[PDB]
């Protein structure tokens, strides 16, 4: 690893600088280096890891959707034949995206999840595992699409079971997990009713627990609740 010679603390410091500079590829490489030091991650460090890779894969997903749309239009009746280039370049971006997902899943499997014992870390990492299998599922078309989807489902479900046992209904990690699992149901699993039910129950149980929160926690929780509500408005 090219970050093997850099101090753990220096990698974290530079990941924060890269975030300020909107250099998310650098940020992700710095945080990968920090994970590979072998120590567990603090809450702030887990969030740096997540922000870095979410921005990297987000750019790849947006590009893949543009190119896939062009490719699908090229295959409609009346469309002029343009040769292999659209497919080739969509495949190039797709392969790079799969590489980033495999990198994140590899960090989770070696060895972030197995060392994560507290609910906040374990739920965070299992949600991340669900998310990056979900991104693999968005582009999957072959023999393994069903297995990729089930891997995402399984990780989200384990995270859900822990979060319901160990976290209050307003906990932002729990809320963000439920949000993303509801997106999985709607966009990946062809289960819009499950998506709507999950989002509604999550919203309502959080609403009833807001009275326990400080002003700052109330702001954290309601920001995510608003995304649940936005989706319910889109879906119903």
């Amino acid at each position: 690893g090219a970050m093997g010679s850099m101090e753990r603390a220096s990698l974290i410091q530079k990941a924060k600088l890269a975030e300020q500079a909107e250099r998310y590829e650098d940020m992700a490489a710095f945080m990968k280096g920090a994970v590979e030091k072998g120590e567990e991650l603090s809450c702030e460090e887990r969030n740096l890891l997540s922000v870095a890779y979410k921005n990297v894969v987000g750019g790849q997903r947006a590009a893949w959707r543009v190119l896939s749309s062009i490719e699908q239009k090229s295959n409609e009746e009346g469309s002029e034949e343009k040769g292999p280039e659209v497919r080739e370049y969509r495949e190039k971006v797709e392969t790079e995206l799969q590489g980033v997902c495999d990198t994140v899943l590899g960090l989770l499997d070696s060895h972030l999840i197995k060392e994560a014992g507290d609910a906040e870390s374990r739920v965070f990492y299992l949600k991340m595992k669900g998310d990056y299998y979900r991104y693999l599922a968005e582009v999957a078309t072959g023999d393994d699409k069903k297995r990729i989807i089930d891997s995402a489902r399984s990780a989200y479900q384990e995270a859900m079971d822990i979060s319901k046992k160990e976290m209050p209904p307003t906990n932002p990690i729990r809320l963000g997990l439920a949000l993303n699992f509801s997106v999985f149901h709607y966009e990946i699993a062809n289960s819009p009713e499950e998506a709507i039910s999950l989002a509604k129950t999550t919203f309502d149980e959080a609403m009833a627990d807001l009275h326990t929160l400080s002003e700052d926690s109330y702001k954290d929780s309601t920001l995510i609740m608003q995304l649940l509500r936005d989706n319910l408005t889109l879906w119903t």
Binding site: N47, V51, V183, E187
Partner: peptide
């Protein structure tokens, strides 16, 4: 039909 919103990077 825009895509459902997942958790943004905060």
């Amino acid at each position: 039909f825009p895509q459902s919103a997942s958790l943004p990077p905060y």
